[PDB]
Design a protein around this ligand. Structure first.
Ligand SMILES: CCCCCCCCCCCCCCCCCC(=O)OC[C@H](CO[C@@H]1O[C@H](CO[C@H]2O[C@H](CO)[C@H](O)[C@H](O)[C@H]2O)[C@H](O)[C@H](O)[C@H]1O)OC(=O)CCCCCCCCCCCCCCCCC
Ligand code: CLA
Ligand code: CLA
Ligand code: CLA
Ligand code: CLA
Ligand code: CLA
Ligand code: CLA
Ligand SMILES: CC(C)=CCC/C(C)=C/CC/C(C)=C/CC/C(C)=C/CC/C(C)=C/CC/C(C)=C/CC/C(C)=C/CC/C(C)=C/CC/C(C)=C/CC1=CC(=O)C(C)=C(C)C1=O
Ligand SMILES: CCCCCCCCCCCCCCCCCC(=O)OC[C@H](CO[C@@H]1O[C@H](CO)[C@H](O)[C@H](O)[C@H]1O)OC(=O)CCCCCCCCCCCCCCCCC
Ligand SMILES: CC1=C(/C=C/C(C)=C/C=C/C(C)=C/C=C/C=C(C)/C=C/C=C(C)/C=C/C2=C(C)CCCC2(C)C)C(C)(C)CCC1
Ligand code: OEX
Ligand SMILES: [Fe+2]
Lengths: 58, 137, 34, 245, 157, 136, 334, 35, 59, 93, 52, 37, 30
């Protein structure tokens, strides 16, 4: 149960509509990108520094 | 050995200040020598500007600005007490400094209570007191 | 260079940690009011 | 004023006084010197109005409805510096530094929230005559920057200078020759600069204290979130105050 | 109830009042607990960071008052919900921070912009850089920094 | 596995290389974390993140700072990154060591081991030193 | 005879349908105002600036949510720790924008739950009961005051307080993981053992009673009808369930005493949640859990990874992404 | 907004005073043991 | 001399704590012998003043 | 912007932009950070490398390090979202 | 005005007359039974069962 | 560290704050030796 | 239109809580 598509179709068309639910997806992009380099050494993820989603000034 | 945690004294060759430290004492072979003139010239320079920051005090009391007199004696003058205690070496030099402080603490104690003459009176007790400090040593 | 601090600490705990039950053990042998 | 300068910091805080511009007393004339530089110009608006489609008796001409500010006490500009250059016909002012933007948000009837950056950046004032008078009246254009700097991330994680550029949780949109070009406008984040026209009016001067102050009126354009919507014209009115030095 | 245990449960209610209050003195108060001795407070180390990068980018010739932040607010100086000039960021919550190294820069309105542009003394820079690196953020094994800091420092406030 | 080829670090501006004895690398870590590591932890600088302890960033300074003799030069006299003016009043140093109480007791061999730690750590950890939180 | 004595006789009467008591004098007005504002703020409430950056986060049902995503949003970062009632807001529209009803609900909740707890004492006094059911209820009161009151205090803002919702709960738990490392903290460890142990001894005690029931019914009717209410006979062979568990593990690990057995069911969870709620409390003041990052090194000095380093890279992903616009400076001090 | 505010301090110290003068009303003696 | 007297001060407090609660928990040992023990209290108190004297002289 | 040309001239192509680069981009040039780089970033739009000598408050030493890297410095079209975050764009090592 | 240091949040003078008439309106109810009793009658219990 | 007349006893002082924990354990040892009666 | 179902589920759940408390089958001895 990854997404509510009615929440996802709306947040794509309206770039002002924010819930707590869409806040949890951006927390999951940080889990999917930052740990997966060291999580799975067999797959050899070599991420550049410039693809890893950072926030502002963190 | 490289990862030995409680090697208090067997590790290093130089004697430490205490087994619970990393630093060596204040003895010889140190690079900080407190007798140097540039440390004395730094402490002397803040004593000269302190009188220059203190003559701007009545200009704000001639005006109505009490917020500027409460912090003029803490904005630059924060580094005074570190120096005037350090320059006070001899006996009678030391008990000359608390004459300057108690005259200075009443300038701040009158600025919070907003008393115009009590700032201007105790300001003149401070310029005359730093005059006693600088002229001796 | 024989690490006098650790030798001092381990003896001084073992003096104190054995000075506590020795108050009770000397009472159990004496059959006093425990 | 100097009456505000009498107070300490602990007496002002929590009272809503630091938000309010000073009240200048009396009227006379003051002449700007050759090297005259304006010191403490603060601007605070006291009323806001957004241009809407109003429901009259039978007609729908565009009129200004007012609005209630919802950001609390953060609207006043302060510490605005700038030199006062003397052209021959008309005295001019060009601002240089100071806090010259104050972001705020007002609410309309209906529940619509309209944010707008209230600003005086790059202001070129021009007023009749040379000396400041109670009949003096200067104004001019200012440039409004965008409400969000380009590295702002929207809820999907898309910005103008950072972030993604596609619907990040809709991965089947970029399939085909067309791609996701149907929602192209919400991916391209465009930094926008618009214009605004302020009109100030000095009416009370001290020359013994060299501080002026009067009523202004400013109109500008609200924000759009980098092309997300059509921005709306925002009118405001208030009082200002300045130290002419 | 006039009995033996009832007087004990009267004290335990009042000693818990004193227990929370001494535990909240130590977090906020910098007067009975000087920052020179106990380290900077929770609120104080949040303001010392914003003041340090204020000094840092002022040396690059940047107007810090008109420096528009990424959200549209002040990157360095913004305005509190009561009207005062404060520091901006997540440090806008601790705008009541009254500390002996920032109170030289106050006015009636708040942080005086004229005094920031001209009078910043280097002991304040030595203080705000000291209170940034020794913020009260630790761990139980006594390594400092954030919860994701590597194991090199040994500090809990 | 601290081989003497790995402990061999560059010592002067010309480019000579000398080796660090195993007490230099051990005191070099304890002194660095106690003195310098409050802000320079892992090579990054907390209070000014532009000017790090990277071997790239030490080399691009207007006096080259990669050497042991160049780092102990910086400790007794810290200029800026372009080396025009001194910031001894705000960086902890030996010249301005009356304000900083942390550097009143440091010998020549103690700064020789601290600068040894700053130079020998990019050789141990190639990308973790001053790489920020990406390379934790 | 007097009007007050005829009112004290009613308000402390156990003959009411629900016992009101003297704590109900400030339980019922508090919790009905926390309720009646919650139902309105969950259904119909406009979006709320939570980050203080004037980016309003929708949280109610009329603004396009559901049961899962909808939530009463915490108050603003602009307010922070300041008390923000309705009369100090200059309009209700300014109140609802800045996170108004989060403080009205939470402060009337913590007063009403701390009065519901004292009400459980009071009726135990008037019924002749030994008093300490309300000490067992101190464990969720400790945990409710930890995430709504104590954690906003030590972090200095109600915006770090827990959002009153379901998806807002998991925004709270994940951001609390990155900034405080709760899983390595031994007080979340001592309450996972409290509720895994609590659900063990619940289903372990509830099975051994239901195993050893005495024949009182037929096979057609229900098992439960062999208990008549208020009977004085014991409804299960307790010697039977003692001999079973006395052979299932060994003999000396079994409580023959049913009083000491029914005390251990009350000890283990409640002590586990007292300790846990003082994990959030000590991590409200940034005394985080353990940090074993870069702890294992070889003789060369290169960092050898552990499971804590893999756990760290999950914490670094949430840390660099939570409140992705609210930060301006390199360290999340708040 | 200063009319609502008056209404709250009525309602608070109405019920707080019922709480305060509830336990002053000889409240330990209200038990099922005696009286 | 301070390092010699404090070392004599610790060894007496080792000798008391092993023996004094044994002297009290016994049903009669304190009443039968306390004038023996009361010397050791008066010796112990006297050492604290001697050490406090020798510390002030040496500073 | 989705498709912004001159991404390379910002920080990483080793030929820097003037009116769009961060002050971190001038760190790769020895001698310019922080003093000489501080003046370039602070003032308004430039049209060429010759306009670098028009900066109010230049020395001969400040013009010297510009004279070294004037092949590496180049000026482009100022897109106004990059011109704001030239002192600080929220990037920290 | 939120962060003013005013007693019990009493901003205006009108809020006092609300507080005094709240404590006293129930105090006068309480004195109708527990007031006007003997203030000189003791007990050697832990708990008194005197009267209504 | 301690004054120079007291640097000798630096190991013994390090044990001293632990000693109040040892009184908590002294109660249980005393309850064991009394036979928990 | 969608949120109307969610509201009906919530207040419909609070109805059966009301009836369970006040219209409960009152247990009786004998
Ligand atoms: C086990 C399995 C579970 C069984 C149930 C648990 C039963 C309790 C077990 C206790 C564990 C204690 C083991 C003793 C070792 C230890 O701890 O040893 C660790 C330390 C001693 O270690 C020293 O710890 C120091 C701690 O740093 C301190 O010193 C550093 C250098 O000075 C820095 O100054 C730093 O700022 C400062 O904190 C350094 O790490 C030293 O290198 C290291 O030697 O013990 C201490 O201090 C001892 C202090 C004891 C009193 C602590 C009371 C503090 C109250 C805090 C309560 C917070 C409540 C929330 C809690 C969660
Ligand atoms: C072995 C058993 C034992 C032990 C170790 C203690 C230990 C303590 N009890 Mg005690 N107590 C016990 C059994 C015990 N009690 C029993 C069986 C009863 C009967 C129910 C009581 C009833 C009792 C009462 C009624 C009170 C204590 C208090 C205290 C504390 C006094 C120190 C203090 O408050 O410092 C903290 C305070 C300061 C440092 C400031 C100085 C103030 C002075 C020392 C207060 C002295 C209060 C005095 C002890 C209470 C009077 C008791 C007297 C009528 C017998 C201390 C923690 C007192 C307390 O405040 O703690 C709960 C208290 O009010 N106890
Ligand atoms: C595990 C036990 C334990 C330990 C080790 C500590 C340790 C400490 N507590 Mg503490 N505390 C505890 C349990 C404990 N607490 C418990 C269970 C409670 C109840 C919840 C409290 C409640 C408590 C409070 C309320 C406070 C502390 C404080 C402190 C700290 C200073 C001690 C102090 O103030 O002495 C106090 C000593 C006395 C009261 C004795 C009398 C002292 C006299 C009056 C001093 C006179 C001084 C005078 C100027 C000298 C001049 C002499 C001249 C005239 C010649 C210290 C870290 C204090 C602190 O720093 O808070 C952060 C504090 O305010 N504690
Ligand atoms: C009776 C239960 C009760 C309680 C405890 C509260 C409590 C509260 N309400 Mg609420 N409320 C209630 C019922 C209650 N409410 C009801 C029934 C309604 C519907 C009308 C509301 C509607 C409502 C709204 C709409 C709002 C509140 C708000 C508040 C908060 C502040 C109000 C205030 O100023 O209090 C007044 C309190 C006092 C003057 C203090 C009285 C305490 C006394 C004096 C005891 C102290 C004893 C003293 C220390 C002894 C000293 C002895 C001396 C010798 C030293 C507070 C949490 C506000 C809020 O939470 O905003 C965030 C808000 O906006 N309430
Ligand atoms: C196997 C996985 C696992 C397990 C079992 C737990 C277990 C626990 N975690 Mg944990 N956690 C985990 C993984 C896990 N964690 C992970 C992976 C993370 C990182 C994301 C966390 C992060 C985390 C945080 C951040 C917190 C926990 C907390 C807790 C505790 C929750 C108990 C609680 O709050 O009830 C206590 C009960 C309450 C809070 C409810 C009070 C309700 C009041 C009394 C009444 C309400 C009445 C209601 C409104 C109406 C009633 C019905 C009506 C009709 C009448 C418990 C010990 C919490 C904690 O530490 O305790 C505070 C907490 O805050 N965890
Ligand atoms: C493979 C099965 C398994 C086992 C054996 C454990 C075991 C444990 N987990 Mg774990 N866990 C599991 C699966 C398992 N888990 C799964 C599938 C998840 C979710 C993905 C979790 C999530 C999880 C979390 C989030 C946490 C644990 C924790 C724990 C520890 C305490 C839990 C506890 O006391 O529960 C309550 C149960 C009891 C008290 C019964 C007793 C259990 C003990 C271990 C058996 C005693 C037997 C003894 C050792 C043998 C000697 C006796 C002999 C003389 C007869 C313990 C090490 C906690 C922890 O980290 O603790 C360190 C913790 O925080 N676990
Ligand atoms: C046996 C008696 C006795 C006692 C109690 C002391 C005590 C002291 N002497 Mg001293 N002395 C003694 C005999 C004694 N001396 C003798 C016989 C001589 C030779 C004639 C000297 C000569 C001497 C000199 C020459 C000097 C001292 C100094 C000192 C003080 C050291 C502290 C300090 O630097 O001052 C600063 C003060 C303090 C640090 C305050 C410490 C006391 C605090 C309040 C702790 C007390 C708390 C409380 C009582 C404990 C709780 C107990 C409670 C449970 C009952 C100390 C108070 C020095 C001194 O006074 O310098 C100022 C010093 O230079 N002594
Ligand atoms: C000869 C050769 C070939 C050489 C090789 C050598 C060789 C032979 C080796 C083999 C030896 C070998 C390994 C054998 C050892 C066997 C062994 C023990 C293996 C298992 C391994 C293992 C890890 C076991 C340990 C785990 C274990 C079983 C732990 C028990 C946990 C435990 C003590 C729990 C107690 C919990 C508890 C207090 C419960 C009571 C509370 C509760 C509510 C219960 C409910 C309840 C209880 C009542 O009481 C009654 C009354 C009622 C009403 C009731 O509700
Ligand atoms: C142990 C747990 C911790 C216990 C709490 C610790 C004590 C906390 C400190 C309490 C402060 C007390 C000061 C007076 C109250 C105060 O000023 O609040 C007054 C504050 C101030 O109120 C606000 O003040 C502002 C001024 O800055 C503005 O004017 C606002 O308009 C005004 O509302 O309001 C509240 O906090 C109201 C609290 C209502 C709670 C009442 C419930 C109490 C019922 C308990 C039963 C009574 C029995 C206890 C009494 C015996
Ligand atoms: C001050 C001082 C001193 C003294 C000291 C002392 C004297 C101490 C004490 C201490 C003590 C007093 C100790 C104690 C100890 C104890 C112990 C260490 C014990 C423990 C044990 C255990 C823990 C066990 C237990 C048990 C049992 C028996 C049975 C049941 C179960 C159990 C397991 C619980 C001296 C002289 C040095 C000098 C310096 C100063
Ligand atoms: O508000 Mn809610 O989250 Ca606690 O950390 Mn800082 O602040 Mn914000 O960031 Mn991260
Ligand atoms: Fe049961």
């Amino acid at each position: 149960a990854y997404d509510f598509v009615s929440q996802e179709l709306r947040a794509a068309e309206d770039p002002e509509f924010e819930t707590f639910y869409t806040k949890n997806h951006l927390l999951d992009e940080g889990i999917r990108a930052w740990m997966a380099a060291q999580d799975q050494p067999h797959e050899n993820f070599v991420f550049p520094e410039e693809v890893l989603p950072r926030g502002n000034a963190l | 050995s490289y990862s030995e945690g409680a090697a208090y004294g067997t590790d290093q060759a130089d004697k430490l200040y205490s087994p619970y430290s990393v630093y060596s004492p204040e003895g010889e072979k140190s690079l900080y020598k407190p007798d140097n003139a540039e440390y004395l010239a730094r402490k002397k320079a803040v004593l000269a500007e302190t009188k220059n920051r203190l003559q701007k005090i009545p200009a704000y009391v001639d005006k109505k600005e009490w917020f500027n007199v409460k912090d003029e004696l803490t904005r630059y003058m924060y580094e005074t007490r570190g120096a005037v205690r350090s320059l006070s070496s001899s006996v009678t030099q030391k008990e000359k400094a608390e004459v300057f402080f108690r005259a200075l603490e009443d300038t701040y104690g009158a600025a919070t209570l907003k008393k115009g003459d009590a700032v201007k009176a105790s300001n003149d007790k401070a310029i005359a007191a730093l005059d006693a400090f600088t002229a001796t040593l | 260079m024989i690490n006098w601090q650790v030798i001092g600490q381990l003896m001084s705990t073992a003096v104190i940690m054995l000075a506590g039950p020795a108050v009770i053990v000397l009472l159990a042998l004496k059959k006093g009011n425990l | 004023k100097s009456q505000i300068n009498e107070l300490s910091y602990l007496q002002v805080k929590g009272t809503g006084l630091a938000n309010r511009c000073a009240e200048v007393v009396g009227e006379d004339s003051i002449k700007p010197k050759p090297g005259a530089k304006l010191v403490d110009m603060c601007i605070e608006p006291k009323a806001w109005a957004v241009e809407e489609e109003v429901g009259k008796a039978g007609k729908t001409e565009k009129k200004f409805v007012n609005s209630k500010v919802m950001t609390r006490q953060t609207y006043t500009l302060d510490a605005i510096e700038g030199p006062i250059t003397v052209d021959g016909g008309k005295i001019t002012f060009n601002e240089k530094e100071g806090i010259d933007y104050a972001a705020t948000t007002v609410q309309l009837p209906g529940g619509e929230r309209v944010p707008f950056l209230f600003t005086v950046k790059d202001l070129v004032a021009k007023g009749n005559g040379d000396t400041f008078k109670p009949g003096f009246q200067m104004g001019g254009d200012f440039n409004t920057p965008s409400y969000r700097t380009g590295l702002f991330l929207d809820p999907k994680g898309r910005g103008g200078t950072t972030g993604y550029d596609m619907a990040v949780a809709l991965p089947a949109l970029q399939l085909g020759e067309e791609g996701d070009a149907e929602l192209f406008g919400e991916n391209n984040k465009v930094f926008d600069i618009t214009q605004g026209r302020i009109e100030m009016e000095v009416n009370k001067v001290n020359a013994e204290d060299s501080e002026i102050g009067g009523v202004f009126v400013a109109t500008q354009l609200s924000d759009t979130d980098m092309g997300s919507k059509t921005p709306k014209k925002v009118l405001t009115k208030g009082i200002f105050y300045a130290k002419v030095d | 109830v006039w009995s033996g245990e009832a007087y004990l449960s009267y004290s335990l209610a009042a000693i818990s009042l004193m227990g929370f209050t001494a535990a909240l003195y130590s977090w906020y108060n910098n007067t009975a607990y000087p920052s020179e001795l106990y380290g900077p407070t929770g609120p104080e180390a949040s303001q010392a960071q914003a003041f340090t990068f204020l000094v840092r980018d002022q040396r690059l010739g940047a107007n810090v008052s008109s420096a528009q932040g990424p959200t549209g607010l002040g990157k360095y100086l913004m305005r509190s919900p009561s009207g005062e000039i404060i520091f901006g960021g997540e440090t806008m919550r601790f705008w009541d921070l009254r500390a002996p190294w920032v109170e030289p820069l106050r006015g009636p309105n708040g942080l005086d912009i004229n005094k920031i542009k001209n009078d910043i003394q280097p002991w304040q820079e030595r203080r705000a850089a000291e209170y940034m690196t020794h913020a009260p953020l630790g761990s139980l094994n006594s390594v400092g920094g954030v919860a994701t800091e590597i194991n090199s420092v040994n500090y809990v406030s | 596995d601290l081989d003497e080829a790995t402990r061999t670090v560059v010592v002067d501006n010309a480019g000579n290389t000398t080796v660090l004895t195993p007490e230099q690398v051990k005191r070099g870590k304890r002194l660095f974390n106690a003195t310098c590591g409050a802000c320079h932890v892992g090579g990054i600088t907390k209070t000014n993140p532009n000017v790090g302890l990277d071997p790239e960033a030490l080399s691009l300074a207007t006096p080259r700072r990669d050497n042991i003799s160049a780092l102990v030069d910086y400790i007794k006299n810290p200029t800026t990154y372009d080396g025009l003016e001194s910031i001894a009043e705000v960086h902890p140093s030996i010249k301005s060591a009356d304000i900083y109480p942390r550097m009143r007791s440091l010998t020549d061999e103690d700064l020789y081991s601290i600068a040894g730690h700053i130079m020998l750590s990019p050789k141990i950890a190639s990308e973790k030193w001053g790489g920020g939180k990406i390379y934790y | 005879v007097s009007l007050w004595e005829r009112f004290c006789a009613w308000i402390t009467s156990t003959e009411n349908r629900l016992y009101i008591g003297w704590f109900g004098c400030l339980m019922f007005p508090t919790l009905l105002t926390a309720t009646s504002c919650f139902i309105i703020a969950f259904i119909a409430a406009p979006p709320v600036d939570i980050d203080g950056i004037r980016e309003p986060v929708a949280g109610s049902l009329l603004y396009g949510n559901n049961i899962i995503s909808g939530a009463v949003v915490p108050s603003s970062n602009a307010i922070g720790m300041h008390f923000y009632p309705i009369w100090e807001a200059a309009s209700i529209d300014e109140w609802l924008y800045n996170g108004g009803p989060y403080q009205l609900i939470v402060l009337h909740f913590l007063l009403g739950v701390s009065a519901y707890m004292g009400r459980e004492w009071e009726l135990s006094y008037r019924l002749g009961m030994r008093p300490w059911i309300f000490v067992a209820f101190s464990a969720p009161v400790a945990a409710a005051s930890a995430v709504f009151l104590v954690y906003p205090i030590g972090q200095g803002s109600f915006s770090d307080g827990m959002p009153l919702g379901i998806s807002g709960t998991f925004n709270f738990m994940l951001v609390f993981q990155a900034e405080h490392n709760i899983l390595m903290h031994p007080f979340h460890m001592a309450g996972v053992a409290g509720v895994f142990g609590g659900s063990l001894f619940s289903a372990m005690h509830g099975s051994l009673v239901t195993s050893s029931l005495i024949r009182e019914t037929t096979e057609n009717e229900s098992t439960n009808y062999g208990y008549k209410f208020g009977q004085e006979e014991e409804t299960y062979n307790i010697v039977a369930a003692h001999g079973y568990f006395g052979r299932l593990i060994f003999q000396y690990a079994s409580f023959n005493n049913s009083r000491a057995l029914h005390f251990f069911l009350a000890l283990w969870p409640v002590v586990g949640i007292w300790i846990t709620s003082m994990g959030i409390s000590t991590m409200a003041f940034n005394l985080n859990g353990f940090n074993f990052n870069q702890s294992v090194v070889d003789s060369q000095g290169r960092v050898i990874n552990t499971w804590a380093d893999i756990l760290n890279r999950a914490n670094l992903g949430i840390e660099v992404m939570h409140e992705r616009n609210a930060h301006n400076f390199p360290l999340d001090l708040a | 907004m200063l009319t609502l505010k008056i209404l709250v301090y009525t309602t608070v110290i109405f019920f707080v005073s019922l709480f305060i003068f509830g336990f002053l009303s000889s409240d330990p003696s209200r038990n099922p043991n005696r009286k | 001399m301070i390092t010699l007297l404090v070392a004599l001060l610790v060894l007496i407090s080792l000798g008391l704590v092993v023996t004094v609660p044994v002297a009290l928990a016994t049903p009669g040992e304190w009443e039968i012998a306390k004038g023996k023990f009361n010397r050791f209290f008066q010796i112990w108190v006297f050492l604290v003043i001697v050490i406090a004297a020798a510390d002030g002289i040496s500073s | 912007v989705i498709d912004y040309e001159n991404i390379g001239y910002l920080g990483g192509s080793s030929i820097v932009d003037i009116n769009n680069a961060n002050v971190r981009a001038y760190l790769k040039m020895p001698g310019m950070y922080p003093t000489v780089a501080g003046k370039i970033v602070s003032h308004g739009p430039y049209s060429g490398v010759a306009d670098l000598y028009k900066i109010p408050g230049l020395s001969s030493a400040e013009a010297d390090v510009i004279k070294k890297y004037e092949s590496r410095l180049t000026a482009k079209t100022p897109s106004p979202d990059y011109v704001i975050d030239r002192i600080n764009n929220g990037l920290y090592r | 005005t939120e962060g003013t240091n005013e007693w019990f949040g009493v901003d205006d003078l009108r809020l006092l007359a609300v507080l005094f008439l709240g404590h006293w309106a129930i105090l006068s109810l309480w004195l109708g039974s527990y007031g006007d009793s003997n203030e000189d009658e003791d007990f050697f219990g832990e708990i008194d069962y005197s009267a209504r | 560290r301690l004054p120079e007349a007291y640097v000798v006893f630096s190991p013994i002082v390090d044990v001293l704050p632990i000693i109040p924990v040892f009184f908590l354990l002294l109660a249980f040892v005393w309850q064991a030796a009394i036979g928990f009666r | 239109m969608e949120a109307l179902v969610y509201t009906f589920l919530l207040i419909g759940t609070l109805m059966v809580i009301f009836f369970a408390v006040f219209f409960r089958e009152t247990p009786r001895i004998l």
